[PDB]
């Protein structure tokens, strides 16, 4: 999602948290948005069933 790596334990063990907040925020945004897309699609399929 635009950060330097996709593994969270990489970022925790490479930076100290005052700038690791920037990377982790990008990951949180990306994963939360993907999860929201999934639950919306499952809602529509539930209505059809």
């Amino acid at each position: 999602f635009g950060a330097i790596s996709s593994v969270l334990n990489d970022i925790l063990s490479r930076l100290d948290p005052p700038e690791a907040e920037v990377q982790i925020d990008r990951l949180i945004t990306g994963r939360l948005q993907s999860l929201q897309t999934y639950v919306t699609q499952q809602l529509i399929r539930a209505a059809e069933i």
């Binding site: 593994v7 334990n9 990489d10 063990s13 490479r14 930076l15 100290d16 700038e19």
Partner: protein, 333 residues
Amino acid sequence: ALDPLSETKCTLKSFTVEKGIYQTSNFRVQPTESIVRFPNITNLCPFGEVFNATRFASVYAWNRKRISNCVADYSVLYNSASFSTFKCYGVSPTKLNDLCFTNVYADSFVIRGDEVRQIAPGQTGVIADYNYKLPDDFTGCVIAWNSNNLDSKVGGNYNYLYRLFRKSNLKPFERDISTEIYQAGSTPCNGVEGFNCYFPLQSYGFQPTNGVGYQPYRVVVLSFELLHAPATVCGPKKSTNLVKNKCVNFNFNGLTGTGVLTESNKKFLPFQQFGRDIADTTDAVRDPQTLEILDITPCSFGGVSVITPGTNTSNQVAVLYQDVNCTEVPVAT
């Protein structure tokens, strides 16, 4: 955190709970102990062979030394006060004491004082366009400090020199040796010298009573690459013993994680070191002291639901541990 009934209250944000079953927060086996595995590298790194060199190369002929197969300590160079600036980019200098690297490159040269701003990656200017360029995803550190007393002479040690004129910009980690003459005019020039036929190199006026911003500074760059190779140069951490089938914290060459290490059937080819999942999580890892392949599985977890009648009736509850044999509940977040 007292009992499941208060847990149900907490997640519904009410003092009252109605009849039914509610799914709640989940459980997890805690890791019990910590395991650190590092290779058997013993000897120390020749930093003084870089920093206490008698001669430093010119910036257009910058010297690179490849440091490998030694156990460094970056704190002992880190906490010295003599450095004018110590700025890193791919990492932060606190973690450098316990992260292990596969090969380290040390670049050294000399520069005029007020263009250390131009040694930073992503900037442009004179030095960044004709003498030394860093790539934009640079992962390392830049150390710089003035050395006016040792190299600058009152006559002027003019063997330090740099390129002025150049045909084009050069790529990262490119270096040119060239005595060709340059044509700043439109007309081509041949032979040696003429009108607007320029020799591309020029020497600094390094003389010691010069003002600041003209001072000679020594610049050292460390440009290690990260965590994807059989490593050589680690940080000074001592190794622990190897524990299997317990929830542990493992630290394999800087790979940090929590789980259970197990004997594997995964028959690695020898040039490999690691192993990933679909979801990009490490699951198979090679111990750097015994060449065996260890499977990594995170510990047990699962669903916790609470069954209650109404609190108007009574305050006794019951628990459903979802999708597990019963026996993991006695050891148990």
